[PDB]
Write a protein that binds this ligand. Structure first.
Ligand SMILES: *[C@@H]1O[C@H](CO)[C@@H](O[C@@H]2O[C@H](CO)[C@@H](O)[C@H](O)[C@H]2NC(C)=O)[C@H](O)[C@H]1NC(C)=O
Ligand SMILES: *[C@@H]1O[C@H](CO)[C@@H](O[C@@H]2O[C@H](CO)[C@@H](O)[C@H](O)[C@H]2NC(C)=O)[C@H](O)[C@H]1NC(C)=O
Ligand SMILES: *[C@@H]1O[C@H](CO)[C@@H](O[C@@H]2O[C@H](CO)[C@@H](O)[C@H](O)[C@H]2NC(C)=O)[C@H](O)[C@H]1NC(C)=O
Ligand SMILES: *[C@@H]1O[C@H](CO)[C@@H](O)[C@H](O)[C@H]1NC(C)=O
Ligand SMILES: *[C@@H]1O[C@H](CO)[C@@H](O)[C@H](O)[C@H]1NC(C)=O
Ligand SMILES: *[C@@H]1O[C@H](CO)[C@@H](O)[C@H](O)[C@H]1NC(C)=O
Lengths: 107, 132, 132, 132, 107, 107
């Protein structure tokens, strides 16, 4: 029910942005949005847990934001290790996690 | 000492008071002393060590301008070398003993800087201020 | 100790200073000690008890944010259950020992509330205030 | 104690901090005690005297409303009888031991006045102020 | 020389007021006015010593006030034990007490 | 190079003033001016070291001032012991002292 950009591409040292939006009951107002780097066939990684807050050890070149109808994940200073699928989730303190449709960052 | 150290630091921030109460001395009902010859000297040493540790902590407090407060905010900025952990990582994921273990190696320099900074600001700058 | 406790509390409010002077130690002219074997240990115990009671009162003072003042006003409202006596009944008809005798049974809860209230106000609220 | 007392008072005003650090106790690396019979009582007396002198100075500080500061300004005007020396004569020509030697005979009355004045101003006047 | 209302009456749960007035040298400006409940043939009772201040143990339903030419004693929530004579006095810290002409509260 | 008033006279209880002026590089802006009482054939005496500041033990009846082009030394409540020659000097914290041409106070 959470939709993202189908696919997206970038180049060296750039900044690729991915969207995450849905209905009012899924992605609107102040429901926390998390972003995971999730390479296909391996283990995920917490990139950004709270809307504007990252995970420890994450390179500072990853940023997150949330509008009133869509959340955005930005990857700056693109490096070859970023070429994976990324997924978002909507959650509150007790409500369960609702993942997204994913987005493959090309280069 | 009633507070449980297994709770997060944000949880023990509320319980600070009972621990600060038990530090000074036990709750009332101090000790009758018959003064046994060659005995009780260990008891006097125990009382002296109690007042000694209390005074050590109050020395650190008074050097920091916090001689009357339990919580006091300081103008010392946090060094990222001490810990790159965030606010929600410290106050929501760590317990007080864990955090003090992580910070123990820098605690000495922290004390020295905290004493120098908080003292200079509240003495030299305030002195020059009322000078005019 | 020069102050006379037979005067009303409003009269001893002026004499607080000499009593606070005598509390710390005697006026100067500290004691030469030849260190008699198996003797003088009572003297060391006496000095330790002196510093112990001084530190007890200063512990109560510092927990109350009054670590530097002799008189400090608190934000603790007075419970009428403690005493229904008025201002002119207390400060003009009673003497300090009388009033402390009347308040002795509640003094413990007064200390606990006074420590909790004066600490919360000056730490949590002031912390949240400078947070913004 | 690192500060050199051969420098002028305006120079040791900067070095106050290290001297105040060494006063409390030695720098960390407290003492293992095997408690020799009829021995070590001199060591307990030494520790008690250390805490006693520290507490004497902190008593003077707390009676003066300066319980949290190293430098505090007071509302006591300077008596010319104590010394007719000027500011540039004191802080640029004299050293701390010299000045304390010159002021030693009046130090007692200075302490008494300083305790009475700083206490009255911060207690009676502030009490009457919040009264309205 | 201090005059009051001759007599006054009330009922249950009401509030009866009594006056106390005299010359400038007796009851004017800021000379303290006291009010005593004084049953005839028995011992008096301090009801109100300072103009707006009561005696300890007095029921709070007794109140006092002082104008620039007369002082007033009010008794609220009237009860059968109030049916006595009441007297006022003018005094300062060293000047002597000057009683009044009294007032009998009927019911 | 520092010039003063040639000579000057006064009387009992009066106040005689002496000037001290020179080029911009000698007596101008904020170069400290000192004043010495220097009886001829004997030892000098520091009267005023900083522009507005005296020496210890000096009678308070001696005063100093500095304008933007001249410094002035005033002697009030004149007494017979003031009948000497007075000299000024221009100095900074490291620059050397440059004395003046002197002024004899008559009475
Ligand atoms: C909570 O904080 C602790 C900080 O102490 C984190 O655990 C530390 O992990 C490092 C290695 O990653 C170890 O070297 C430390 O000894 C650990 N400290 C402990 C266990 O007290 C822990 O990862 C944090 N929790 C989360 C979810 O990030
Ligand atoms: C002055 O205050 C004291 C309060 O202590 C009053 O005396 C008390 O009276 C009660 C009974 O009425 C006794 O139980 C207490 O023991 C008394 N306390 C004493 C004697 O210290 C006294 O009545 C007050 N004075 C006036 C004029 O009201
Ligand atoms: C610097 O200050 C000291 C004050 O102590 C001055 O020396 C004092 O001189 C008087 C007599 O003039 C003696 O009685 C004191 O014992 C001296 N005190 C000392 C030596 O500590 C000294 O004159 C001052 N310096 C200048 C240049 O004025
Ligand atoms: C804090 O970080 C600064 C930044 O370079 C460093 O110079 C300083 O030595 C550090 N101090 C401590 C106590 O870690
Ligand atoms: C103070 O009075 C309130 C009013 O009911 C009561 O709840 C409280 O327990 C009292 N506290 C003390 C210490 O007397
Ligand atoms: C301070 O000087 C005044 C001025 O006469 C004097 O009355 C007072 O006694 C002096 N006090 C001390 C402590 O020297």
């Amino acid at each position: 029910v959470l939709t993202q950009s189908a696919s997206v591409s970038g180049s060296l040292g750039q900044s690729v942005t991915i969207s995450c939006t849905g209905p009012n009951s899924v992605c609107c107002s102040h429901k926390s949005i998390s972003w995971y780097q999730w390479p296909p066939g391996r283990a995920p990684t917490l990139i950004i847990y709270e809307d504007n807050e990252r995970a420890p050890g994450i390179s500072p070149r990853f940023s997150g934001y949330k509008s009133y109808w869509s959340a955005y994940l930005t990857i700056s200073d693109l490096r070859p290790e970023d070429e994976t699928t990324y997924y978002c989730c909507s959650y509150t303190h007790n409500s369960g996690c609702v993942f997204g449709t994913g987005t493959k960052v090309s280069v | 000492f009633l507070g449980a150290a297994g709770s997060t630091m944000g949880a023990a921030s509320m319980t600070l008071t009972v621990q600060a109460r038990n530090l000074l001395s036990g709750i009332v009902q101090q000790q009758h002393l018959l003064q046994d010859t060659h005995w009780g000297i260990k008891q006097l040493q125990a009382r002296v060590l109690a007042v000694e540790h209390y005074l050590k902590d109050q020395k650190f407090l008074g050097l920091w301008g916090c001689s009357g407060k339990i919580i006091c905010c300081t103008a010392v900025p946090w060094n990222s070398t001490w810990s790159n952990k965030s606010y929600e990582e410290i106050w929501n994921n760590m317990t007080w003993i864990e955090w003090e273990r992580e910070i123990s190696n820098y605690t000495s320099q922290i004390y020295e800087i905290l004493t120098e900074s908080q003292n200079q600001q509240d003495r030299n700058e305030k002195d020059l201020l009322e000078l005019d």
